[PDB]
Design a protein around this ligand. Structure first.
Ligand SMILES: [Mg+2]
Ligand SMILES: [Mg+2]
Ligand SMILES: [Mg+2]
Ligand SMILES: [Mg+2]
Ligand SMILES: [Mg+2]
Ligand SMILES: [Mg+2]
Ligand SMILES: [Mg+2]
Ligand SMILES: [Mg+2]
Ligand SMILES: [Mg+2]
Ligand SMILES: [Mg+2]
Ligand SMILES: [Mg+2]
Ligand SMILES: [Mg+2]
Ligand SMILES: [Mg+2]
Ligand SMILES: [Mg+2]
Ligand SMILES: [Mg+2]
Ligand SMILES: [Mg+2]
Ligand SMILES: [Mg+2]
Ligand SMILES: [Mg+2]
Lengths: 53, 268, 142, 158
RNA sequence: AAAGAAAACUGCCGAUAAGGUCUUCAAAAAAAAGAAAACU
RNA sequence: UCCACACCGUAAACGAUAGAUACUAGCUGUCGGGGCGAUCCCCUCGGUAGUGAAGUUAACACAUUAAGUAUCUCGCCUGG
RNA sequence: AUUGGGCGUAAAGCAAGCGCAGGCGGAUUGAAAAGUCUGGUGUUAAAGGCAGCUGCUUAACAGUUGUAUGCAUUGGAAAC
């Protein structure tokens, strides 16, 4: 019952695969985080003029 | 359709011969040939080529993508000059002398040390007449020491992303540092090694000054092709691979000298 | 036609015999083991392979039809770590454990399995709850 | 280390060695660092002064941070963590009981994120070994998805 | 004309009033990212 | 202290480790039976040792002759 | 320490053996059904127990309905 001799004689197989190249997505998520910093400094500048008349 | 080394050449270079059966790790049964009816331990040639191709494949993506590979061979004299030869051919960091404790895990202190080496070297290159004779000779000797023990590590500024080990047994410190820091390490196991420590095992010899040289150049050849300079032994025919056996009975691989292991001094 | 080389002997307790064999094989990373075959061991092993902790179990007989031994293998993954985590026997010889249906145990908040042979041979705890019938409790396997 | 990671002292012993005249005294601290969302580590350090001991302990705790998974805020299945002669029993709890832990386990449970948890210290009362036992119990936990991938069933369905 | 070694050695030698510091404590420690602004 | 016949029944009577049963890497010795046929050495089945990983221990350490994974039975322990 | 502990170095393996009664006990088949599980009926006094409600200015409290545990008998299940 169930016999199938799959054969998995690939033990202690390699865990690492590529040369940390997947980091391409880590560079895109860091670029998207820098664009959200430039717009926050424009809107803080517009609010200083309503409290001076 | 990709090719590689030749099967006749592996048999003739003695890369399918391990060490004496008395000295063997029970965890290496997968690669060993029908040793059940055999004298000295050996390996399978098909498994050898597959493992070699995998290690070759892995090192090439790293070297093409601008990784930093470190070679550490501080064993037989031949191996030091062997490791030196790859350094001349490719601008890879090397550790030919003794592996300092914490070369990787405590990289900060060794980074400070190599920075001191570089700073002292450049001041001396700039020169001055104040150096005179006595202090200059003393200063030259410290400089000599930091190249002999850090001459191949000065180039790199960050932890390497891969290690190539000649003997996992002899470099137990190096492989332990690689394992704890989760860095790939490849090694040439010789029937007496724990497979957990190494990542890409490449069943081969380690006592023959011919098998060792052939395999080390093959890995260097992957790096050299990735770096875009012509290869030396990989993807090459018969006429150009022939190599000689170093001098200093006959080149072999039997492990003896057992009489130098008596009982630990005891009694009362 | 499967051949062997070693003589096969076994301990007397058929539930913990398998349990000792399974636990030792798990700890030693061994794959192929052999033991003497009994109908209780065959049936409990059958539900075990249905519940998914072991892969295959083949029972064979002698050419004389006087002896049977069951030789099972474990289901190791690619990285060579087993699926079984721990086995412990309750109804040891001497002290037999009898629990009614309402007091049928739940192993590891239902993740593990409790093996219960009530009246229609061995049966897993979940299907035993479905039938609302209880009985002998052999061992906890998770 | 850049997280909600809170720091707290779980024990401050006073160790000393003997030299050729006098006793070299150093303070030892056992700090438990946790972000209260699934990241928690522990660090024990010794130094000539309490601030430096604390400094070394906090540095060590952030270097060794383990990952923690929660099910409904609690532990999925009952587990006994063993470390030396210290045995700590963890048991799933219904939402509302609160943290019924005390001492090193209570500090660990709060810093890990877990809410409802039943605990009992069945062994010794040395804080490091209960935490060792506590960490062993929490790290040995099996998710109901790893067993699914192993035994090949459907996510959580029976 | 190398296989050697080489050797212990002993006399005698007892005791030390009581209770006693010393680790106080880590809570952990003050300040950069700002701007600045038109006005009829 | 020795001998013969009668008692005494205690020892650090120690492997400081009750007996039986099943499973769990290996290496180096040595002993016995058996197989081959120069010894020597190779294999099998057992007894006695050393080294040694998983495993166990508070640590020392044990580690296929377990103090490991388990079952049966007996004896014993509960601060000084 | 049945659930829920130990006996190498901390308390604890009798000096060892032959051992009845006791405890435990190979595989397969048949029957019975003592264990084991389950259905029906009877009973397990009332107060107390837990849940809900009412009444006392709410409570404490009182009342109210619900709420098991075991035994016996009968009818089945046959894995141990
Ligand atoms: Mg002095
Ligand atoms: Mg005199
Ligand atoms: Mg005196
Ligand atoms: Mg006196
Ligand atoms: Mg304080
Ligand atoms: Mg006595
Ligand atoms: Mg004696
Ligand atoms: Mg030993
Ligand atoms: Mg007393
Ligand atoms: Mg006790
Ligand atoms: Mg004692
Ligand atoms: Mg005894
Ligand atoms: Mg005794
Ligand atoms: Mg007897
Ligand atoms: Mg009897
Ligand atoms: Mg039977
Ligand atoms: Mg009543
Ligand atoms: Mg009342």
């Amino acid at each position: 019952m169930g016999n199938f001799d799959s054969v998995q004689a690939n033990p202690y197989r390699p865990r690492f695969k590529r040369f940390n190249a997947e980091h391409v997505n880590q560079r895109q998520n860091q670029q998207n985080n820098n664009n959200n910093r430039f717009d926050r400094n424009r809107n803080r500048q517009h609010n200083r003029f309503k409290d001076k008349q | 359709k990709a090719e590689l080394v030749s099967l006749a050449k592996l048999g003739e270079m003695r890369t399918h011969v391990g060490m004496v059966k008395r000295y063997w790790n029970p965890k290496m049964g997968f690669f060993i040939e029908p040793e059940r009816k055999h004298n000295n331990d050996h390996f399978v040639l098909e498994l050898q080529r597959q493992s070699l191709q995998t290690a070759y494949n892995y090192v090439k993506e790293v070297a093409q993508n601008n990784g930093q590979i470190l070679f550490v061979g501080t064993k037989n004299d031949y191996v030091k000059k062997l490791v030196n030869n790859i350094a001349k051919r490719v601008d890879v960091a090397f550790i030919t002398q003794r592996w300092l404790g914490g070369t990787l895990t405590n990289f900060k202190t060794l980074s400070i040390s190599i920075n001191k080496l570089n700073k002292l070297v450049e001041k001396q290159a700039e020169n001055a007449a104040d150096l005179t004779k006595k202090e200059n000779l003393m200063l030259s000797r410290e400089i000599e020491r930091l190249e002999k023990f850090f001459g191949g590590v000065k180039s790199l500024k960050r932890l390497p992303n891969l290690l190539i080990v000649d003997d996992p047994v002899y470099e137990k410190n190096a492989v332990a540092e690689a394992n704890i820091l989760r860095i790939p390490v490849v090694a040439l196991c010789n029937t007496n090694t724990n497979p957990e420590l190494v990542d890409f095992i490449i069943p081969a010899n380690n006592h023959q000054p011919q098998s060792t040289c052939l395999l080390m150049n093959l890995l260097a050849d992957a790096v050299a092709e990735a770096k875009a300079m012509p290869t030396m032994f990989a993807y090459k025919p018969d006429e150009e691979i022939q190599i000689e056996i170093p001098q200093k009975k006959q080149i072999t691989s039997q492990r003896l000298n057992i009489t130098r292991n008596p009982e630990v001094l005891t009694r009362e | 036609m499967i051949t062997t080389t070693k003589p096969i002997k076994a301990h007397f307790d058929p539930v913990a015999d398998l349990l000792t064999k399974i636990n030792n094989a798990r700890k030693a990373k061994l794959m192929t083991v052999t033991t003497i075959a009994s109908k209780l061991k065959i049936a409990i092993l059958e539900i075990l392979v249905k519940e998914g902790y072991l892969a295959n179990f083949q029972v064979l007989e002698n050419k004389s039809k006087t002896k049977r031994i069951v030789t099972f293998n474990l289901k190791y993954t690619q990285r060579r770590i087993p699926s079984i985590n721990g086995v412990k026997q309750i109804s040891k010889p001497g002290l037999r454990i009898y629990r009614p249906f309402e007091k049928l145990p739940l192993v590891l908040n239902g993740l593990g399995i409790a093996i219960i042979s009530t009246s229609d041979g061995v049966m897993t705890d979940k299907v035993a709850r479905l039938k609302k019938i209880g009985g002998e409790i052999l061992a906890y396997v998770w | 280390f850049k997280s909600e990671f809170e720091e707290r002292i779980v024990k401050l012993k006073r160790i000393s060695k003997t030299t050729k005249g006098g006793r070299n005294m150093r303070f030892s601290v056992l700090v438990v660092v946790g972000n209260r969302k699934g990241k928690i580590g522990y660090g024990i350090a010794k130094a000539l002064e309490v601030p430096n001991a604390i400094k070394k302990a906090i540095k060590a705790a952030h270097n060794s941070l383990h990952t923690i998974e929660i099910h409904k805020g609690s532990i999925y299945h009952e587990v006994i963590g063993r470390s030396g002669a210290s045995r700590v029993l963890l048991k799933p709890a219904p939402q509302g009981t609160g943290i019924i832990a005390g001492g090193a386990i209570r500090a660990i449970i709060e810093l890990a994120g877990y809410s409802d948890i039943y605990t009992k210290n069945l062994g010794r009362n040395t804080p490091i070994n209960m935490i060792h036992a506590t960490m062993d119990g929490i790290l040995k936990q099996l998710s109901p998805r790893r067993v699914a991938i192993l035994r090949n069933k459907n996510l959580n369905e029976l």
